[PDB]
Design a protein around this nucleic acid. Structure first.
Ligand SMILES: [Mg+2]
Ligand SMILES: [Mg+2]
Ligand SMILES: [Mg+2]
Ligand SMILES: [Mg+2]
Ligand SMILES: [Mg+2]
Ligand SMILES: [Mg+2]
Ligand SMILES: [Mg+2]
Ligand SMILES: [Mg+2]
Ligand SMILES: [Mg+2]
Ligand SMILES: [Mg+2]
Ligand SMILES: [Mg+2]
Ligand SMILES: [Mg+2]
Ligand SMILES: [Mg+2]
Ligand SMILES: [Mg+2]
Ligand SMILES: [Mg+2]
Ligand SMILES: [Mg+2]
Ligand SMILES: [Mg+2]
Ligand SMILES: [Mg+2]
Ligand SMILES: [Mg+2]
Ligand SMILES: [Mg+2]
Ligand SMILES: [Mg+2]
Ligand SMILES: [Mg+2]
Ligand SMILES: [Mg+2]
Ligand SMILES: [Mg+2]
Ligand SMILES: [Mg+2]
Lengths: 180, 141, 83, 33, 218, 25
RNA sequence: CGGGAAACCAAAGUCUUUGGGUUCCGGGGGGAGUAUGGUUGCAAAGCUGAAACUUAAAGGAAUUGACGGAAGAGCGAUUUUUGUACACACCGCCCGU
RNA sequence: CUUUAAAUCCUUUAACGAGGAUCCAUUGGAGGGCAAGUCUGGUGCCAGCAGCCGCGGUAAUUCCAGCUCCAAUAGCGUAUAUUAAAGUUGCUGCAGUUAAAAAGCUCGUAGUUGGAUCU
């Protein structure tokens, strides 16, 4: 006996057909448009959307007055509205089935850094985030897959220690200044 | 027709249990004769000592001489013909050497032209045949 | 037919057989749409009004379109009651 | 320059060794994929 | 230039029939390919499903002909399938395209649960048969997509179905029978009597009867 | 070989075995 | 009428629109209805009944040809009589020592 | 410095640290199934590939190589047990005229199943 925990799970599922032309084209379009590293990042979001759809479909088979349906669909809709994929006017349980993977892809920190003008490319946004130049309202975040909540949207900035956010110049500038 | 009574559970279960024995794979997996006859004894791989080198004629309409080795397993002492797959890899094997052998891919069934051969050589003298073929490792000597 | 808002959502509404109430499909080429003229009770000439019947091909293949047309015409008063 | 005609290649080699290839070309000519 | 040879073609060319649903209502056979071009027009897209060589044994040797399978549709409720055999591949493809757009049927689309927005799936479970091949279509929830084999999926997409579950039995390696069975299953969607079609039918003037005076002139 | 004569040959071989493979032996 | 791969079947129908009751019984082709055990019989044999091993097909219905010491409609190939296990087409295929 | 029983690791921080940024990404494939070259040089039913169909007997889209091109990616091949695919064990839900198949026929115990009717 030990005092350790063994709880873990996978975050993606591989497609059944390895070489399907349409699927390859769609996934490559998604990767190119959102600057993703590989196919696994598409499959992760697809798995998340599949789980949400499965929960919603299981809640749609109960009676409308069922206490568990009222309690859990409300929480699911509240979370979806909180992360920004859903809208306040569309908080019915049927609209969850109308969500697409691009809606979840639009809420990553990598795409929000690019959409807010802090970066001049999606790949530049990924590079900036991974190099500790971006902070979220107090905290330096270097995870591109960070999912931005609605109330945090206004609070993305350069870090105070960054050469871009008013900090000390970097290694290359100091060396070049020492040169001349 | 099948019985659809409300109290026929015993009949249905007994009939299914008895008719499962007419499935080739179920009977092979649950009878025990195949496991007894299997030289590996249920293992994925085995180790043996190379008794000698042989050449097996490819079945028609193909014409070739497939290079194989007769080996004897260490755990049970059974004799086995294994295939050495690559262009010129038979020169990497010497007699009385120790080899690692795996299945050919069809679960005890012969593969391709080679008649009656269901095993292939993986490592010779504790080094993989792939590394010897690609020139990454040398024979220990 | 229509959604929760009540708006009708269909390409078209197919017509049903007058004999058997079955739907007459778009590729049913053995179906018939026949008109029977109405006469004036005083003179007996063509009024200009007509009654329309539709028979599907399944009934026609059965040889039951004659009796069906006869019964439909009797029900509409075209054929005499003491037929 | 017209070098390769998928229709002629299929109609000629449909029963030869290179059938499975030429068919694969002809589909690329037809469906655009 | 198009010169129709039938009454229906003359009516369509003279702009007397508004939509193809008027023709579908009266189950009038379509014998001219230019009618479908006139109505559906640019929305039609076709795809070759298979080229199949068949052989007839003769005294001198085998005689080979090529059979083309072409599926067509506008992705918005209409679908057709055509099969044509010829000596040349291009001739067979042209004939198959003509035969496919001649036999174009409308598709009825329904809801799985709450009836909100536009229809997205089949109204109910529908089965089609061809040879030994049986194909079954089952309604699916919104956002599910088409869960089927590659061959039925193309026809289901061309018909305009977004979501559907599919089952199949029999020798589905026969591509022609596999396609014809799912085409039959799709065609059976408008022939199913649902409780919302129970209303008594109000008859209307047939195009032959309505425009007889114009037909007499031409 | 005709199945009838194959069956007859099998029966004759079995009878020959039975004579050779005596129960007393 | 409807079925079915078709030949055909008012049953071989009322089957993905799949549930009236119930008995026996099949699971790719060989090895093989063989070996062994049990049981019955005077005998011949009857009933029950494997495995190791081997193989990518064997088989059904129908079509066009070739052979013979014979006279708009079909899912689809396809559209003088007849038979075929032939299709490199009887100079064929194929069985046992 | 912090961490800790004392350490290590992570986190925090000085100084050094990237142009071929040589601070070099691999594992399998390129006839079909199945994404991707009947390009060039060798070999010539040999050597070999090939899960299956097949390739190789002097112009090999398949072997041995060069180039190029595909797939997943710090991971990717192989052998074996097992699940889905298998409506090829079928309760849901399979078959039994000719493809494997209904006992030669009848009786009959156990088992299974059992016609209407009572506010
Ligand atoms: Mg060969
Ligand atoms: Mg098959
Ligand atoms: Mg049934
Ligand atoms: Mg068997
Ligand atoms: Mg076997
Ligand atoms: Mg014709
Ligand atoms: Mg026809
Ligand atoms: Mg005869
Ligand atoms: Mg014949
Ligand atoms: Mg490589
Ligand atoms: Mg190469
Ligand atoms: Mg391949
Ligand atoms: Mg390809
Ligand atoms: Mg072979
Ligand atoms: Mg050469
Ligand atoms: Mg070459
Ligand atoms: Mg299984
Ligand atoms: Mg299943
Ligand atoms: Mg099996
Ligand atoms: Mg079912
Ligand atoms: Mg079966
Ligand atoms: Mg039989
Ligand atoms: Mg009998
Ligand atoms: Mg009893
Ligand atoms: Mg009762």
């Amino acid at each position: 006996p030990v005092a350790r925990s063994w709880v873990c799970r996978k975050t993606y599922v591989t497609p059944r057909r390895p070489f399907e032309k349409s699927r390859l084209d769609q996934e490559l379009k998604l990767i190119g448009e959102y600057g993703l590293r590989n196919k696994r990042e598409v499959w992760r979001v697809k798995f998340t959307l599949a789980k949400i759809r499965k929960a919603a479909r299981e809640l749609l088979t109960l009676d409308e007055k069922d206490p568990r349906r009222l309690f859990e669909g409300n929480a699911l809709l509240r979370r979806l509205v909180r992360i920004g994929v859903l809208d306040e006017g569309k908080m019915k349980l049927d609209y969850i089935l109308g969500l697409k993977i691009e809606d979840f892809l639009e809420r990553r920190l990598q795409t929000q850094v690019f959409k807010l003008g802090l970066a001049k490319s999606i790949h530049h946004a990924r590079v900036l985030i991974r190099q500790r130049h971006i902070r979220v309202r107090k905290q330096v975040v270097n995870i591109p897959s960070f999912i931005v909540r609605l109330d945090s949207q206004k609070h993305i900035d350069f870090s105070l220690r960054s050469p871009y956010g008013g900090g000390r110049p970097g290694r290359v500038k100091r060396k070049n200044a020492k040169k001349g | 027709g099948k019985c659809r009574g409300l109290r026929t559970a015993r009949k249905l279960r007994s009939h299914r249990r008895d008719q499962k024995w007419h499935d080739k794979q179920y009977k092979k997996a649950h009878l025990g004769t195949a496991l007894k006859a299997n030289p590996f004894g249920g293992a994925s791989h085995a180790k043996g000592i190379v008794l000698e080198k042989v050449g097996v004629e490819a079945k028609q309409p193909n014409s070739a001489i497939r290079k194989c080795v007769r080996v004897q397993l260490i755990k049970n002492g059974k004799k086995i013909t294994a295939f050495v797959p690559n262009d010129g890899c038979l020169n990497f094997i010497e007699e009385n050497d120790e080899v690692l052998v795996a299945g050919f891919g069809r679960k005890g069934h012969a593969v391709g032209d080679i008649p009656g051969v269901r095993f292939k050589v993986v490592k010779v003298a504790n080094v993989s045949l792939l590394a010897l073929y690609k020139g990454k490792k040398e024979r220990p000597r | 037919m229509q959604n929760d808002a009540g708006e009708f959502v269909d390409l078209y509404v197919p017509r049903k057989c007058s004999a058997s109430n079955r739907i007459i499909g778009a590729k049913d080429h053995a179906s018939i749409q026949m008109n029977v003229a109405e006469v004036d009770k005083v003179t007996g000439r063509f009024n200009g009004q007509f009654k329309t019947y539709a028979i599907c091909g399944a009934i026609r293949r059965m040889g039951e379109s004659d009796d069906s047309i006869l019964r439909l015409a009797k029900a509409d008063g075209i054929v005499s009651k003491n037929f | 320059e017209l070098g390769t005609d998928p229709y002629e290649d299929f109609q000629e080699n449909w029963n030869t060794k290179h059938s499975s290839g030429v068919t694969r070309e002809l589909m690329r000519e037809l469906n655009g994929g | 230039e198009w010169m129709p040879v039938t009454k229906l073609g003359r009516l369509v060319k003279d702009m007397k029939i508004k939509s193809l649903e008027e023709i579908y209502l009266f189950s009038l056979p379509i014998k001219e390919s230019e009618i479908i071009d006139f109505f559906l027009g640019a929305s039609l897209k076709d795809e070759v499903l298979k080229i199949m060589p068949v052989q007839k044994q003769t005294r001198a040797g085998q005689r080979t002909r090529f059979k083309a399978f072409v599926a067509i549709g506008d992705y918005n409720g209409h679908v057709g399938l055509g099969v044509k055999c010829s000596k040349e591949v291009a001739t067979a493809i042209r004939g198959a395209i003509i035969l496919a757009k001649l036999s174009i049927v409308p598709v009825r689309r329904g809801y799985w649960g709450n009836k909100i927005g536009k229809p997205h799936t089949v109204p109910c479970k529908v089965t089609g048969r061809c040879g030994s091949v049986l194909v079954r279509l089952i309604p699916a929830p919104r956002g599910t997509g088409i869960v089927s084999a590659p061959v039925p999926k193309k026809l289901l997409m061309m018909a305009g179905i977004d979501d559907c579950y599919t089952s199949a039995r029999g020798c589905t390696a026969t591509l022609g029978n596999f396609a014809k069975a799912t085409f039959d299953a799709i065609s059976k969607t408008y022939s199913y009597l649902t409780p919302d079609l129970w209303k008594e039918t109000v008859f209307t003037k047939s195009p032959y009867q309505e425009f007889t005076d114009h037909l007499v002139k031409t | 070989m005709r199945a009838k004569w194959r069956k007859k040959r099998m029966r004759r071989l079995k009878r020959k075995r039975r004579k050779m493979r005596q129960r007393s032996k």
